Each structure stands twice: as C-alpha cells, then as structure tokens.
C-alpha cells in the first residue's frame, strides 16, 4: 500500500511544502520517504511510521517538521503504535494518562512545540511516564 | 478463563486467519511495553476489551478503512490491573497478549470505513 501526504516544513528558516510517501509492505515493513522539489531528501525503514518519522527527523537536522508527530508532547501508546502502524499517537500532559480526545494523526499540521529533536521528544515522554 | 478482545489492524483476513498476530520482538517487560513498545520491541500483541477503542486506530484517525478483529484467548495480561494508576493509557482497556495470538483463536474480521462506520457483515474465520 502507498499513501501520500503533503506537509509543511521549515527548511533553514524558510517555510516550504514537502510530500511524504508511506509504503507499507509485507512482514511489517514501513517505508517513509520525504520528497521536496521532486527530489527524495531522505527515507526511513522501520516497523511503524512514528519510529520512521523520528529517524527521518534525525537525518534532516536542518528542518523543522510542522507535524503532530514532531511535537514535544506527542507519542504513541503501545496500542496506538501496534494497531495503527504508528500513525495515531497521543498529545500527553503532565500527570495525566492519555485519553481518546488526545489522539492525533502524526502527519496532521502542528506549528507549536515542534522545533525539538526526536531525542528531546523521547526525554519528554520518559518524564511524562514517570509523572504518573 | 477465556475472554473476547478486539484489535484494529489493516492487514488482510487472508493473512491474519492464516498466520495469526505475531509480535515484533522478545521483550517480556510490561513496564517497558507501556512506556515504549518499540524500544525495545515488545513480545505482546495489543488488544482491547472495548470494540469501540479499535476504530480510530483501524482507520488511521479517520483517514482509511481497516478491520476490527475479534479473538478469544486465556493468556492475556490486563494492563490496567498489572500497572495500576501508572497505566499510561488506561482508557484503552488494554489486554496485552504475550507471544501474540494464534490464528485458531481469531474469530473474525469486521470492516470499518474511514468515517468510523462498521460494516454490517463480519467475516468469520473457518478455523473455528
């Protein structure tokens, strides 16, 4: 299966439009590609698209991704990762378990709290998990 | 004691009724599963007691159609009971299946469209 999604990015300070390709193949293989100006800037291969996206953002350190999956407080639950191939995640809040109304699509638009690295996102998530 | 649980999944029932639900890694640590089941990949298949909790996942947040599978098993771990108030997504009513779910334990597959509408017909697994 191949799905495509246009996204907004900030490349070296400039607002730009890019296109993600999600290629889901047999044996849990998720391939996430990003195209910009018809050129493939990067690709990640993993078993879910949230992991793919974190790898992609680490490969492209000069780009801010204006997407929910790049937001500091967003992370999949085990269930959302497993059942949705990482496409559905949660916006998390200090001291609170995640609720259905907190669910998001990782490639929906977001421009707040996204100028952060995948490692900072993992750190926020670890501190959140400990806050419960 | 056996219980019915449900799982959203985009994979075909031809594949699932044949192979069942397999896990992605060997970690048996339920705490690590709840924190991040990709780091390390956990030896559990996630399911829920509540069929409605599968819909947003099966449809990728209303973007595509997918399936809700039903299964009957006796080896699952009730995540909320095991983790208590620490359960990070307790509203999901998660029963984590250690080692996955055999194909013979899967009852059927019911399609759901992107708008969240469950189809009328459930496709039953002939292995039952």
Q: Domain boundaries in chain B?
A: 3-121
> Does B61 sit within 8 Å of A97, measured CB to CB?
no
List of chain A residues whose C-beta atoms are within 8 Å of the C-beta of residue B53: 79, 100
Per 3-state DSSP, chain B is made up of helix, strand and coil in percentages (nearest 5) of 25, 35, 35
CA atoms within 13 A on the CB side of B10: 28
Q: Which residues pair with A64 in a beta bridge?
A: A10
- Minimal Cα distance from A96: which residue of B? B88
Give dist(CA A58, CA B26) in Å, integer: 26
B102 by DSSP, 3-state: which? Answer: coil
**Listed residue (B64, B79, B92, B70) closest to A81, CA to CA:** B92
Residues 6+ apart with CB under 8 A from A23: A1, A2, A30, A31, A32, A33
Solved using: X-ray
Give dist(CA B125, CA B122) in Å, integer: 10
Q: Does domain B3-121 have CATH number 3.30.70.260?
A: no
**Element (DSSP H or E) covering residue B45:** strand B44-48
Cβ–Cβ < 8 Å for A86, A30? yes
Q: How far is B62 from chain A (nearest CA, A)?
A: 9
For residue B84, the 8-state DSSP code is: G
> Does B88 sit within 8 Å of A97, measured CB to CB?
yes
For residue A26, the 8-state DSSP code is: T
């Amino acid at each position: 299966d191949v799905d495509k999604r246009k996204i907004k990015i900030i490349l070296n300070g400039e607002m730009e439009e890019a296109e993600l390709h999600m290629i889901t193949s047999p044996n849990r293989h998720c391939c996430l590609k990003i195209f910009h100006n018809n050129n493939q800037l990067a690709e990640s291969n993993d078993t879910d698209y949230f992991s793919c996206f974190a790898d992609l953002r680490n490969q492209l350190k000069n780009i801010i991704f204006l997407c929910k999956g790049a937001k500091i407080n967003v992370y999949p639950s085990a269930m959302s990762r497993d059942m949705s191939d990482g496409i559905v995640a949660y916006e998390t809040t200090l001291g609170q378990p995640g609720l259905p109304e907190n669910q998001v699509h990782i490639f929906d638009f977001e421009d707040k709290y996204v100028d952060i690295t995948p490692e900072e996102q993992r750190k926020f998530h670890s501190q959140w998990f400990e806050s419960l | 004691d056996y219980i019915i649980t449900y799982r959203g999944d985009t994979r075909s029932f031809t594949e699932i009724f044949d192979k069942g639900f397999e896990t992605l890694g060997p970690s048996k640590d339920l705490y690590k599963h709840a924190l991040d089941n990709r780091a390390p990949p956990s030896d559990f298949v996630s399911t829920t007691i509540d069929p409605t909790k599968t819909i947003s996942f099966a449809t990728k947040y209303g973007q595509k159609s997918g399936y809700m599978y039903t299964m009957k098993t006796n080896h699952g771990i009730d995540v909320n009971k095991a983790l208590g108030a620490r359960s990070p997504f307790a509203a999901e009513a998660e029963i984590a299946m250690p080692g996955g779910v055999r194909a013979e334990d899967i009852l059927g597959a019911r399609a759901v469209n992107a708008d969240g509408e469950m189809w009328d017909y459930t496709i039953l697994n002939p292995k039952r």
